[PDB]
Symmetry: C2
Subunit: 253 residues, 2 copies
Amino acid sequence: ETPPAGMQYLYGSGEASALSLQAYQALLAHVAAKVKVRPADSVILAEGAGLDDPRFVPCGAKPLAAVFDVDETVMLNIGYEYHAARTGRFDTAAWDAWERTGEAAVAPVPGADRMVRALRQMGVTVVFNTNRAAGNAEPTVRAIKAAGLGDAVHGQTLFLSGDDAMGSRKDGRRATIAARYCVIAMGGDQLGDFSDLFNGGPSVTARRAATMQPAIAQMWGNGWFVLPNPVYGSGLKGGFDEVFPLDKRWAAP
Amino acid sequence: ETPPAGMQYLYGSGEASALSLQAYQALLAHVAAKVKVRPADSVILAEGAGLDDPRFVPCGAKPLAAVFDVDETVMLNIGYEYHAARTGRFDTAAWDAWERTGEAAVAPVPGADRMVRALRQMGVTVVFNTNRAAGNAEPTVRAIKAAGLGDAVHGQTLFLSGDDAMGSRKDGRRATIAARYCVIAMGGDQLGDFSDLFNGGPSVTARRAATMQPAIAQMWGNGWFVLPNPVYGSGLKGGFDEVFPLDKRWAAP
Ligand SMILES: [Mg+2]
Ligand SMILES: [Mg+2]
């Protein structure tokens, strides 16, 4: 029995490991450049801004920070995905149990513990913005600690689903973070970890086109830093016609 | 019917698109830094060098170049993977037909056509090192052209499996390239696209550990640039015990 190809890739391969280390190398160099030369804009979009003409919450004199998604961005949910592979199960009740009892089965995303330590040695505050539930803040704090990612504090450096009434939408929390910090880098494994504009409607092919809108494309590896996730979530959608465009079809002999 | 999760991710998602654009943004900035300040070492390992103490073919006065894997690094093999998803088939005869007849069903990896044009505008020679077969050089040249990747020439900027007697091992071709160019960046989707030392023996867990050997880890996003591939190849290996380590297991209630 072998696990699903996506988990073999994400959890088992050196390919995925190298991909993640590249992401954090680029982030560390970017942060270091902006620690020496503070920017005028943060990397968080302003309220009402669109992807075509992005405007950003200004950096100002606010303390420097970096924002991170938690799950499959800085922390691997190994125990949970093991159970999903064993069971074949989108199990919301199981995920709730996992938020409460998974602190002993998490690992850092390759390079994320070293990157988080370097950021703090540079004087940059490490802020987590995750859709784990607010009522599970304390076990989530302990899991973050167990992955070697340091100390997170609910409401100061850790923001969770249910901290506002926006549900899985993260823009509201992003606005709260950007109102007190100059956010000079932002990491995630899902497009919703950078803007809610990618979700809540857009099709699979529309979301992929939107990442190549030039004013948005310039962010990738240059303020917005992406970690791989072919195991669950927004990337795992679309029928044959959205995945394989009709001008690129072919059949073997 | 939906395609395999890995193909939904790689071919359909904006997540994979953003991940690829980040890789090429980091590569472009790296190349530009080295065009201004030529390095002493290339990014290609010297003969007999090990991953723990890497030595590199020197840059010297040789003309500047960047080396790229072709398949799923700069070119998406959309037609072929469509057929694999339709058919469920590791089909070596089908892949041979595809090398010969697939030029009309390929697309650039997101950002790869723009990156290849920028490299040439910077005066950097774009060299391809692929395990497509030497006897299919001409259709491979045409497919590279159709993906918007420019003009490749067998034996000058394009090196193929069978150009030497080493089979799928790419070190021999890497040595030939590094003997005439100063290779300042190298891109790939498989660890064999950077060194043969990752393959031919090492286990799934050994290969992943090897990417974090510190002298090697420093390469990722800093000379060695990685593109995602959870669809086929070296990343899709390993049983449950290699993918989900035994100190990170968990079971739902
Ligand atoms: Mg996540
Ligand atoms: Mg390849």
